[PDB]
Amino acid sequence: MVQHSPKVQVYSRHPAENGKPNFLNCYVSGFHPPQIDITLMKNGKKMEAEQTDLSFNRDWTFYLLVHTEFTPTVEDEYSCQVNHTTLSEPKVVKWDRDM
């Protein structure tokens, strides 16, 4: 029983410009075991997205990329929600256009 909790980054592909099409990423890494629940959200509601093929680093810990196209606006809140056995509660990371 050797487990590691996931690290999470939420970010756009290009610098965000309001009303211009872009790509939203939720990058999750350093976790074990492999089963994990990763959800991109718009205003606290699930966006249908895509998740890359399961891959891992030299230390055996896995990484995943969940992504979908999006058009950022002033008003809309974007986030990523991650659930894993290592976590006491869902990990929720808000998207910040400056990070």
Partner: protein, 275 residues
């Protein structure tokens, strides 16, 4: 510089529901080029890079045949280890394998590697000499003796010195237009006030390949990277990478700070400051 061909296998058992889920992914350097997922009615090895699409049916049939046989051996391996570790069938378990070859700029081998896991821990690994094995526990020692008797290390040595290096060279030539040309980062410094007294300066590096990069901050021409927050290098989603490094500075003092960027694509390393 150096180049690598690497494969990553993962198998996860599914108690009471059928065969294990098996995933295989292949990489040339930082670029993924092939995939296999057991979860399909008639699963095949598939391209994930445009430059490998050229390969004819012969190639795809052989890779598919090898990966499907590997998926089956990983299925028996999971069952075998339930016996070795005296574990219940009801609980899910997992095994990983990663292997590959690193070559010099002229194509010659630098190192070959192969390692196996069980449930996130080292299980067994091929040694540097590619002739012997290191076993992590008493269960892995059973595997070790078995693989010694079967002459497994010789087959790996043959593959890593032969097939691995030869095909990496073929892949690099097939995708020379993308794999061999470094993509320089687009760099900028952004300013984000925290208050009238403090300000965050974030140094961005965007759209670069390969992933390896160095971001450092200086203040008054002295190193202060230890004060900075550096995020892990992350994929952009289009085959390129991103990274930033940020410092909190006193308001009015921003011209004293410089961000320095080193990347393979840059003919000259760049130093930037807030405009």
């Amino acid at each position: 510089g150096s180049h690598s061909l690497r494969y990553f296998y993962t198998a996860v058992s599914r108690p009471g529901l059928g065969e294990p889920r098996f995933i295989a992914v292949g990489y040339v350097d930082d670029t993924q080029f092939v995939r296999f997922d057991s979860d399909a009615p008639n699963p095949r090895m598939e391209p994930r890079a445009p430059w490998v699409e050229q390969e004819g049916p012969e190639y795809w049939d052989r890779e598919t045949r090898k990966v499907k046989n590997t998926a089956q051996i990983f299925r028996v391996d999971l069952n075998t280890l339930l016996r070795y570790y005296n574990q219940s069938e009801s609980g899910s378990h997992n095994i990983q394998r990663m292997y590959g070859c690193d070559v010099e700029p002229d194509g010659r081998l630098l190192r070959g590697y192969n390692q196996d896991s069980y449930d996130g821990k080292d299980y067994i690994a091929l040694n540097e000499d590619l002739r012997s094995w290191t076993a992590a526990d008493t269960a892995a020692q059973i595997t070790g003796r078995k693989w010694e008797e079967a002459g497994e290390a010789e087959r790996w040595r043959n593959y890593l010195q032969g097939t691995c290096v030869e095909w990496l060279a073929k892949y690099l030539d097939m995708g020379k237009e993308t794999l061999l040309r470094a993509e320089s980062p687009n760099t900028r410094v952004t300013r984000h006030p925290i208050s009238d007294r403090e300000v965050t300066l974030r140094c961005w590096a965007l759209g670069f390949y390969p992933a390896e990069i160095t971001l450092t901050w200086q203040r008054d021409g002295q190193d202060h990277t230890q004060d900075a927050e550096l995020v892990e290098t992350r994929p952009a989603g289009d085959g390129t990478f991103q990274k930033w490094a940020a410092v909190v500075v006193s308001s009015g003092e921003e011209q004293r700070y410089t961000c320095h960027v080193q990347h393979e694509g840059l003919r000259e390393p760049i130093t930037l400051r807030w405009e």
